Amino acid sequence: AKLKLIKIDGSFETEPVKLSPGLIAKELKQQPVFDAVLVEQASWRQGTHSILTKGEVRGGGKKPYKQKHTGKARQGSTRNPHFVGGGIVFGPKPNRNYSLKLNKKAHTAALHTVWSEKLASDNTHLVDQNLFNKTEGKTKVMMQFLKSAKLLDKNVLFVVNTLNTNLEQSTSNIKNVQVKHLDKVSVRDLMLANALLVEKEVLKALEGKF
Amino acid sequence: MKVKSAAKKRFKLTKSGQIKRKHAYTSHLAPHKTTKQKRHLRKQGTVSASDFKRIGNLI
Amino acid sequence: MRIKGGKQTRVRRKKWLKQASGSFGTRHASYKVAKQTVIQAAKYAYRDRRNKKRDFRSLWILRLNAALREQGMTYSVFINLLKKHNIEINRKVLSELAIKEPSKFNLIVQKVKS
Amino acid sequence: LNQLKSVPKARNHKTKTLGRGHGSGLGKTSGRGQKGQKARKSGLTRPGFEGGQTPLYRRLPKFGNARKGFLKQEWVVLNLNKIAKLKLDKINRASLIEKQVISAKSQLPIKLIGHTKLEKPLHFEVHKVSKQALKAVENANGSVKLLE
RNA sequence: CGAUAGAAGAAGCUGUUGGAAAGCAGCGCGCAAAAGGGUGAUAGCCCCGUAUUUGAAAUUGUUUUCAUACCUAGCGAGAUCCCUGAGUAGCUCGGAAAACGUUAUUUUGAGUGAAUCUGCCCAGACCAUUGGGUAAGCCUAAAUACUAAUUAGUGACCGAUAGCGAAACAGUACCGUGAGGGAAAGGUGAAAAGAACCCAGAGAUGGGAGUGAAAUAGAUUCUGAAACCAUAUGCCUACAACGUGUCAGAGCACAUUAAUGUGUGAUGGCGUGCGUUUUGAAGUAUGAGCCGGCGAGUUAUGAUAGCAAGCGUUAGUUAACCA
RNA sequence: UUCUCGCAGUCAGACAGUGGGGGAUAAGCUUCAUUGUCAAGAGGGGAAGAGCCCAGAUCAUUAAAUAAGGUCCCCAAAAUA
RNA sequence: UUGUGGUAGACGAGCGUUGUAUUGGAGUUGAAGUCAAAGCGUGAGCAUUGGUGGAUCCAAUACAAGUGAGAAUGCCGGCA
């Protein structure tokens, strides 16, 4: 599945660039990607959810009740999970973390498989340093390029390895673009985007880890 | 979650578990055994499977 | 995170009170009584399903014997005239329905006479 | 596997929850028996209790140990069967790290164990040779030097 | 270099639903801002604004650089010269800590009490060899918890029987003398455009005429359900011992979540409530007035087992820490 | 049904028949073993009837045979010597 | 073929459900939601329509459950 380079206008060129073997996998596995997105998607908590249990609520314990010569229960405590005193034995804690961990070899297999799938999904046209230059700070030209090839199906995630002022100025005021670095990646991002752009150089760099 | 020292002082462990215990009539009284009984009650012994997990998981 | 859903209980209450109907006093107005009365109504339905077979069997026996006694025969004797003679698949309920047909039981009693 | 169609391989086995109805499984019965001490509040008693029964651990003598206040020094052992598919003449400490054999912080003397003969001409250094192991390495047309 | 005043700072029209648009449709336009909200429904370009962008009058702080007190500083030869932190080290009756339960080690409540450098103590009793260093004088930045307190910001943060006793004029009223204990709270309507005129009525109050897009937008208040209290529509409906019921069902009123339709019921059969804990209850064993809200099987460090997955012949796997 | 394994429920039992011990062959009585019942499982029958007899209920049915047992009426069932 | 009685219990099939992210949609030319009907389901439920309300929710794979109310001589509130 050789991929042809594309220009900033949307027209292709005469060089269909060969795909590095550092992304194509042998067998497709759905469990490593599943638990990788499981661990990555979580941990949105900021310790926000916190409640006071019966031992954490404020109050002076006393017994206004007398068991004999009364109709209600004894209930020598007033801050109960079922009275108006409050305090539930079960609730959210600011210390729960739900520890999860991913190995090295399984992570490598999952990343290689997802690189094979995303490179062969054919939702990408290769870019080069030449179109990186002569780039205005306007996001309007970026939108012109995007709609020239009309990538209006899914959000597009570019992967970059070198920083340019045009890149930081542009690609920042559009609802349908996102940019990340070669090693600043996570399978959750790839499967969420379902559309991406890749530069020529990073293929050989990623070939190393395979 | 520790290893119970006070209970582990009375047994030995071998390959693939197989906890080993001692033989009674050794501490305070044993003028009541035959020579056969004296020598075989100096040797070692095994345990039952009724508490096998409950002692293996604990000790 | 606190879970909502203070309405699903009332939805279930309305659904289960929809089953109950035609109840006197505070039996179609109290949901706690409504649950028990719905259960008892379902058990009464089960009872009817297990009872009506025998009930209607005895009903047909009595209704047919009422006619049979007029002809001078009892039900026990009447079965014998069909058991060995006049080989048929006719039923007690079938004979009771045929009672509603005039001059046809006469055909049956002259058939066993033949 | 996208978040509108993501599926696992073979997972999602049954979980346990007992406070959500009887017909849903283990309601007020809860599976905790009836009229018991462990069944009541603060059940699941500590290990080391039999409910008043006399245990045997305190009714049993203690095993012998002729080494109190001292420990047996650890020694690295190169098993002959395992070393069969390895090759390094004149074993030294500074190279077994690459082969995942020796530890970074170790001064353990080497001991040779096993009559399971290997399949290559190798000259080896060890602090101790076992007689059966010595015969096995003699049959391996190699050599062995006795270290300290 | 900030902080405690600031300031510059891009980009839209037409028709429509419409009471009102912000929504929709047509063509757009900017973007370094299509970050967030309001704006008469459901706005990137209407604003608040924002990104970006700089500023301190006056004060304080973080340091950098410069000139610069103060003192900081080894190698050779002798000499049984002197010194090297005395009630010191020790020993006894014992505590206190040391993981220790007095034992190495440290300190002392009561006593006695040396030595010198070849000295002392120590190397979990102790001596001998070996080895450490010469306490018993003193300050010492470095990593320290916490946010009472502040800024900037965030929330698979609770949302008015929740979140803090306290969204609110909360520890408030109030109770106990007194320590102490300790309630109740939101949303009119787009803009009050807060119901003018009239009527009855002593007034209060209500009802018509109005405004307001809507008066289920009228002040009670975002809406406004069941228990509870009456009412009328079809039928039954005051000689019958009924957990007021079931199945059939005359007869009557209907005409559908349109269907072998629904509703009531003169009448025949059938017809010892529930959760509880017990040898076992119809139970006359308890408990429940009803309705509605609420209300109780979890987390952390893990281990074991089943399943699943990675790797798997010299295995797998990192803790901490760091980008 | 035998082997391992995880999770267990009972752990204060009662009822019929027999052999019983106790008692006083007085006890639907206490305590033992055996055939069954329940606790774990409905129904039909006998005046009501959990443990007595007949027993083993996926369900709909207004079908058949019928189990013990019953046949003047209640209510299904016949008479003759 | 056994079936399909069943306490405790082991055990399978699952559902509803709030929030997360997509994937999308619907929406004052109608929404969450109230009431009713003479529906769909083996069930945990789903509805459609009508009044009713004049601004928000849903549908399908996964994620974590302060999660699912018959009594607790339950508490609160209202009504007796």
DSSP C5-59: -SSHHHHHHHHHHHH--S--STTSS-HHHHHHHHHHHHHHHHHHHHHHHHHHHHH
Q: What is the CA radius of gyration of chain D?
A: 29
Helices of type H across D28-95:
none
Resolution in angstroms comes to 8.9
- Beta-sheet strands, E only, within A125-208: 156-160, 177-181, 196-197
Phi, psi for residue D125 in degrees, rounded to 5: -125, 130
Distance of CA A46 to the CA centre of its chain: 17
Which residues lie closer than 8 Å to A13 by C-beta, 6 or more apart? A4, A5, A6, A7
Q: Where are the domains of chain B?
A: 1-59
Quick one: A170 exposed, middle or buried, by C-beta within 10 A (0-12, 13-18, 19+)? buried
Q: How far is CA A81 from CA A49, A71, A129, A210, D147, in A?
A: 18, 21, 64, 56, 72
H/E element, D126: strand D123-126
The experimental technique used to determine this model is cryo-EM
Strand E nucleotides, any atom under 7 Å from protein beta carbons: they are: 30-35, 153-159, 161-165, 171, 180-182, 226-228, 243-247, 263-265, 269-271, 273-278, 290-302, 304, 306-311, 313-319
Handedness of CA A132, A134, A140, A145 (dihedral sign): negative
d(CA A113, CA A133): 32
| D72 C-beta neighbours (distance < 10 Å), count | 6
Number of separate domains in chain A: 1
**Look-up of token digits 């049979």:** C68
And the tokens for D123?
């000259």
Residues of chain D contacting A, Cβ within 8 Å: 1-3, 6-9, 11
Domain limits at A181? 1-210
Q: Does D47 contact chain B (CB < 8 Å)?
A: yes
Which residue in B7, B24, B26 is closest to D57 by CB distance?
B7
Q: Are strands D76-79 and D110-113 parallel, antiparallel or unpaired?
A: parallel
Q: Which among D129, D131, D130 is positioned nearest to D144, based on CA atoms?
A: D129
- The full length of chain B comes to 59
**Mutual angle of helices A202-209 and A105-120, in 10-degree steps:** 150
Contacting chains of C (3 CB pairs or more, <8 Å) are none
| A96 C-beta neighbours (distance < 10 Å), count | 10
| CA C7 / C1′ E189 distance in Å | 29
DSSP states of D91-121: --GGGTTTTT-S-SS--PPEEEE-----SS-
d(CA C73, CA C52): 27
